[PDB]
Amino acid sequence: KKKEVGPKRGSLVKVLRPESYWYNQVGKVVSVDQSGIRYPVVVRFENQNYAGVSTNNYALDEVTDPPA
């Protein structure tokens, strides 16, 4: 596949998922799956959720560049 399916690894992304804990929050891209799964973008956050985790999987349409 040409280029990559998702964003650049290690780049900041903003989560647009409304039901997620990190809605309108900035995280770091750890890995993007090239197989074609539903949520390939792995995002790690500095602030953990109520469950104590800090990493999650998101699709391509729920991640964008952080506004400045």
- Residues interacting with another protein, by CB under 8 A? 18-19, 21-26, 49-51, 66-67
Which residue, 30 or 53, has its beta carbon nearer to another protein? Answer: 53
Minimum gap (Å) between residue 26 Cβ and another protein? 8
The residue (of 5 and 26) whose beta carbon lies closer to another protein is 26
- Farthest-apart Cα atoms in the chain, separation: 38
- Closer to another protein by Cβ: residue 34 or 49: 49
Query: Which two structure tokens, joined as six digits, stand for 41?
Result: 């973008």
Q: How far is the CB of 51 from another protein (least distance, A)?
A: 5
DSSP 8-state class, residue 23: T
Pairing state of beta strands 63-64 and 55-58?
A: unpaired
Q: How many helices (H) and strands (E) does the chain have?
A: 0, 5
